[PDB]
Amino acid sequence: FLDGIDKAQEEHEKYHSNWRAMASDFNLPPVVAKEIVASCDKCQLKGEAMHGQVDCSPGIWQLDCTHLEGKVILVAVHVASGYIEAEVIPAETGQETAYFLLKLAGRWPVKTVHTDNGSNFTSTTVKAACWWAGIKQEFGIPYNPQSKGVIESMNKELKKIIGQVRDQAEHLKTAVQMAVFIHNFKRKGGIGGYSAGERIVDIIATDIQTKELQKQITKIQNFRVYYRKGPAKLLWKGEGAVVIQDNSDIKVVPRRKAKII
């Protein structure tokens, strides 16, 4: 195919044909044509077609600012549950964001906050507030709103609800608080058929309960399991299978070839 390879390369240096065109027109194997395309710097103009997945630990909160009727609304969401908080703030300053986050931390167990690189979220005042409250700040990839999709979606949802209750309030702060109330306690759905408040209560209570229960189980049930190795710690034996943890690797093995001491 060598001569065909030279003709294909010369043709691609002019037209930048895709691999199918050069495979058809020069009798090339598909791998050769794909290699010719992949060696061209001018043809790499597309990324892989997939999305990532945001973290969903019970302590993760996503914060954003939205705008409505010339007013600024600072909105935080609990990723696990969909529970929201929202405040109409006079300006997008570090002081207001720091106050909002400090008040949020004193009402729920906030561990990390996920925000974009807006000037209010990256101020030294917000940094000091997070340091005092023991909150870890996570700005992801700059100018990548998808990394905050949850809060972004909540923005949409929040504004939608405001459009339904704006006539019941005389001021936008009242309508925002009404919308927060309605989203948190008057809309049911999701994993458990819950509202956001019910779901967040379930998430936090489950976290503490399971942590204490597993602490008790590990304190009482102490065993060493040998499979195929060293003294791996027993995690869960049952249903003809043993889940163990050998060298920071939680692995599942069949009940066979496993001795428990």
Added chain:
Amino acid sequence: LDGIDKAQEEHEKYHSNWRAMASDFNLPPVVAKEIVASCDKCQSPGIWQLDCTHLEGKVILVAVHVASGYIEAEVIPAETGQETAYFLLKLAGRWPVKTVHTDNGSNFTSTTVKAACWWAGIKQEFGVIESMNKELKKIIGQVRDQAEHLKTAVQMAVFIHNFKRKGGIGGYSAGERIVDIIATDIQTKELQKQITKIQNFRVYYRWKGPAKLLWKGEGAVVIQDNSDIKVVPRRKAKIIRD
């Protein structure tokens, strides 16, 4: 199924509530609730207390969840009805508030607060509060130097009180206690919903007279009749709505 009679014996002797019976004997909550409701020998989460604190010439509105002692306190620009209504609306949007107790002040009586409570479905009624309001002042005195403005110090004190102070029987914090209490109330509300849904049915078994349905399992039907709980096969019972 096999533990129903054991559950009745346990309640007759030890008088255990339905949750303990359902945990120990593995019964559906409706059956244990009806067992404990059949003993004539036998027979709060949604209440908050509001108050105002004056410190350094500024007004702090403090709401205490009394079942847990959970404090939500905000510095407000003026002691007016609008600020109180806004604070109550925020509180109701954050937590399931059903009742608030106030000291019949001018701000707590205004029509704006009444309208906010009516919209949010909150009932208004005119030493936990004092104890928590004094502990909050103590913490504010401790952490005043760490902040410039009073509002930041108040929120820092609220954070410390809710999550950094621990005590009681189990050594939990106010936040932990309030999540436990609210979860228990959610369970209570779901059980009440299940009982209300089930109560509109009647069962004919073996046919005998009308009977009260308790549980509709996969291969069994637990009913009550003549103050006695019996489990019958699904095919042997007919359920109608009345």
Added chain:
Amino acid sequence: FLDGIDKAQEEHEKYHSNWRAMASDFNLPPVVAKEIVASCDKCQLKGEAMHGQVDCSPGIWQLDCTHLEGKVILVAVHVASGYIEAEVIPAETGQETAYFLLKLAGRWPVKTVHTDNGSNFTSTTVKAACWWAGIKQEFGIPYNPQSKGVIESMNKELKKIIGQVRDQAEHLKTAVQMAVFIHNFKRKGGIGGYSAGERIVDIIATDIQTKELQKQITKIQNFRVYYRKGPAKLLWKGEGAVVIQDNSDIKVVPRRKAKII
């Protein structure tokens, strides 16, 4: 449920709860809660989640204008094949669009053109050109780019190719013509593993060939089929089934209960 219905209606007039919330909180059947939500004018804020499908007859062309480096490019696409034409025009006027469409009609069998409501496409000159050339103009729903998705996508594609060949030309018109060449004859894919030019040639030739072949078949094969009715025209008998056309309704019937005369 009547009392529960009044409580649910009163609660929804304030919070506008979704059907699940009112079903849970008022012991309502799901249909009753859904009816309560569906009777609220303030809750109808979402359309059905589907897309339409554009026409794909062999005579359909989609025309659009795109902009690049301050220049205007008028781009037409043949929907069936993906074959494109593109011209750099001095201005977005009715004269230029009419000239472009008249030249396109004289080179390919253009039957209908699908354009948006831009001022150049809705001018009286373009209307007169289409009337003379026997072209039917189809503006769809105003401000609905999806109805022209094909041409819109081609815009993207065209610009992409231009970005790969802009360094080989000194003027944008030359680069545009190079991009048209590359798209039409140097990119293979789609249904038949074709290029756009090969595919359009196949589409047009297949159209004429099948039309003449079916004309001959219908001229020679004349039969009347009675099924279950009147004298339905026979379309295709074979494989234990008969396709017929009774009263402008082409229907398939089993070979049983069908007599051919």
Added chain:
Amino acid sequence: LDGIDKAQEEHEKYHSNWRAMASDFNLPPVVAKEIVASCDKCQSPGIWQLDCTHLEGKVILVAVHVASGYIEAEVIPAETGQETAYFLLKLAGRWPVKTVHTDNGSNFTSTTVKAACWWAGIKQEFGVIESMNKELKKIIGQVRDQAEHLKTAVQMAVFIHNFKRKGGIGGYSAGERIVDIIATDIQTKELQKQITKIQNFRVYYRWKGPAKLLWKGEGAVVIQDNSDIKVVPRRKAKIIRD
């Protein structure tokens, strides 16, 4: 499969090309092509003609596809190399142009046209053209009154010539004829590609000597050996690359 010998008999007597044999006897095109290529007794779509026409003080560049007589004509502002190169690039992007014949004019010889042809892979060589160029002028005279400018009249005449004038053996139009011719050339190119791909293989059957592969079917393998075409079972033959 059964019609191979009948195909050889038909070509020996009637001397039919491979397409007719493949249509009548249902053979893969490679087998019929090799049948017609084995008869030593036995043994255009991509060419265009360019010209310029001067009318009413303006220059019209006319390209004629001679296999069909298909006209593509545009009024150009000036008879320069840049305009000719732009016209050729448009033509090559619209149709599969491989050869253009020009009358060795100043514009057709310029380096810009040479560069455009080199980029587009067009070969340049220095009574169809005259006949079509006179018919175009006749149609322009007919339709001049229907338009104000000359370019619009020229495009109207091109439309009428390509799609509204019919003639020849089958009564087709120039557009119809050019699509048929280009489709036939696409078929020719695909058959050539298939033959080129297949020719790099050798087959051992029944083992006999090396043989030329023709077709690789689902349950048969058609090969040639000693100027005779035979079909052998897939399991009975081994194919290697040399």
Added chain:
Amino acid sequence: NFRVYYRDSRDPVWKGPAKLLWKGEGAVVIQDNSDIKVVPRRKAKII
């Protein structure tokens, strides 16, 4: 008869209810106040 709630054209606010005059695959024709309009089925809800 049907009720149609629609979003007409680059306007985020939803209108309705409107009478459904015609239904097709991908679009509908509505009469919202002596004003016949054509709306994509993506931007409409029929009850």
Added chain:
Amino acid sequence: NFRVYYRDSRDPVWKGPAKLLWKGEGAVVIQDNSDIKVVPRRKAKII
């Protein structure tokens, strides 16, 4: 070693090739000219 071609941030023009320093699920860390950058895997291609 790998070659990375990426679109960095609100810039339609693609850069590259860059050395891949780290690969994760949903993003990558690239060094394009003594300039360490983090790019979503939607905006990158690794060869």
Added chain:
Amino acid sequence: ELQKQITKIQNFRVYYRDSRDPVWKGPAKLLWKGEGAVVIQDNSDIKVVPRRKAKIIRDYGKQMAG
């Protein structure tokens, strides 16, 4: 006479879509062509498809490769 034309018209391939399925279905076998509808044979299933939703080709690459 007729059988040859019928086989020829059955030699054409059809790609089509359904009213609510956005993906294109494979090369069905053409059985009948009309002004508005096309009758096709896809995987032992005889269907009637709108002409607006059908791309009818021959596929000259496959025709030359038996």
Added chain:
Amino acid sequence: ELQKQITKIQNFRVYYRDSRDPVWKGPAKLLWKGEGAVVIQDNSDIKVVPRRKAKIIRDYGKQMAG
């Protein structure tokens, strides 16, 4: 003692996602919880899921409806 706690921890429900599947998988059975990983039992299949991809609830509606 231990068996009661193990049954209680198995009473919890887990919703999870895989590294490249955007849809949420149903309420698996919790078997073990750790700092970084969770061991679950979904449809006779024992899996290890990152803690970052797991929502662990109890579902109080189902607990009250046996």
Added chain:
DNA sequence: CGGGAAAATCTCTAGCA
């Protein structure tokens, strides 16, 4: 009838004012 390799198909995303 069966593994390894290759071809084919499925899934999914950006960009198109």
Added chain:
DNA sequence: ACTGCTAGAGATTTTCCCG
């Protein structure tokens, strides 16, 4: 009474190749 699509990058499923 009109209507999202298209080309490429991985990932997974199907087919082929010779035992």
Added chain:
DNA sequence: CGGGAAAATCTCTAGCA
């Protein structure tokens, strides 16, 4: 074991600077 009806799940889209 089986139709009709209802509940549950799947598919898919706009909007979020």
Added chain:
DNA sequence: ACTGCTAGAGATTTTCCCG
């Protein structure tokens, strides 16, 4: 070394109800 999501509208698949 970090990462689209969410709630609602149809459409289709599963389960339940009483013979």
